[PDB]
């Protein structure tokens, strides 16, 4: 696969630290973390233009990110809250093109 996410499903409790991993095989410079919610579609949380780069999207609050290499972009919830329950989608992109992963479902109890 172009883009793989792990885990695919995750149940956490409030206050729990949760990390979602996205790894790509396209050598793309750009990566993105979105979440998908009914009544909003996809909203961009953080993105990255290369290793060591992360920048805020529209809804960055409560999330960190890390792009330790070209291939990997992680989304870090230091202290999970119920408003973070959602389905997360990561994408990689290089000019013209975007590939999306299959989605990660997170429920926070």
């Amino acid at each position: 696969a172009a883009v793989t996410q792990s885990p695919r499903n995750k149940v956490a409790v409030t206050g729990e630290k949760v990390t979602l991993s996205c790894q790509q095989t396209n050598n793309h410079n750009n990566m993105y973390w979105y979440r998908q919610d009914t009544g909003h579609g996809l909203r961009l949380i953080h993105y990255s233009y290369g290793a060591g780069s992360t920048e805020k999207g529209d809804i960055p609050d409560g999330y960190k990110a890390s792009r330790p290499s070209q291939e990997q972009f992680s989304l870090i919830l230091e202290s999970a809250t119920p408003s973070q329950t959602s389905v997360y989608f990561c994408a990689s992109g290089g000019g013209g093109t975007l590939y999306f992963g299959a989605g990660t479902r997170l429920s926070v109890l």
Binding site: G50, G52, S53
Partner: protein, 228 residues
């Protein structure tokens, strides 16, 4: 050079309110430095840079950039050590024939087999002009880049005192000041300009391009930080 006024220091709060992420700067000083001992450049892209065949994580070479050609020629074809802060986004390093890689500024000292006791330097930190601590850094180089010192210092403060965090800092402004034995001094603003969003690494790290070198045994280091 001389010392900064408070109102001229870059503000963490301005960086955040321009939608910047201080984590870009955190990661430069938390991640490991590029290091190479007794290496010789293998090629160049432009005449003011030197490309060195040193390993960093999964990269197999680094381009270091100097402020002008004569500085590059000072080191070209010589045995040097390399110590510096790499960046990747905006790094331009054309292959020997296809574009990205690992880049840095400066970083260079001549390799010396007579260069073997670690020296300790005490970094003096003062916060809000009212509390101090010191910690020490070491290097085994008699002549050391300012970059090496600056990195060793910011790395300790980032890891131990929240100098940079993903979305801000324990501080609002600050600068690191170096004083040479002959008594002259210069400083760097520790924080990014508010206009630098997205963060563009080469514009922050080019302060190291002058490859300023100092004597470990006598250099004085002071950090001054203000909280919000």
């Amino acid at each position: 050079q001389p010392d900064p006024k408070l109102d001229e220091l870059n503000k963490v709060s301005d960086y955040k309110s321009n939608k910047g992420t201080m984590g870009n700067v955190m990661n430069l000083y938390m991640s490991p430095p590029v290091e190479g001992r007794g290496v010789i450049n293998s090629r160049q892209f432009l005449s003011h840079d030197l490309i060195f065949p040193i390993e960093y994580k999964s990269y197999n070479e680094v381009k270091t950039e100097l402020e002008n050609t004569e500085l590059a020629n000072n080191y070209k074809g010589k045995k040097v050590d390399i110590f510096g802060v790499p960046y990747f986004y905006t790094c331009i390093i054309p292959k020997s024939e296809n574009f990205g890689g690992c880049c840095m500024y400066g970083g260079l000292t001549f390799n010396s087999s007579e260069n073997e006791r670690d020296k300790l330097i005490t970094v003096q930190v003062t916060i809000d002009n009212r509390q101090s601590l010191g910690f020490t850094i070491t290097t085994n180089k008699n002549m050391v880049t300012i970059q090496e010192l600056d990195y060793k210092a910011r790395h300790w403060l980032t890891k131990e005192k929240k100098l940079y965090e993903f979305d801000g800092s324990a501080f609002e402004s600050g600068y690191i000041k170096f004083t040479e034995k002959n008594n002259t001094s210069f400083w760097f603003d520790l924080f990014p300009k508010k206009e630098l969003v997205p963060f563009v690494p080469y514009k922050f790290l080019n302060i190291y391009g002058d490859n300023k070198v100092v004597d470990s045994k006598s250099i004085k280091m002071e950090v001054f930080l203000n909280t919000h």
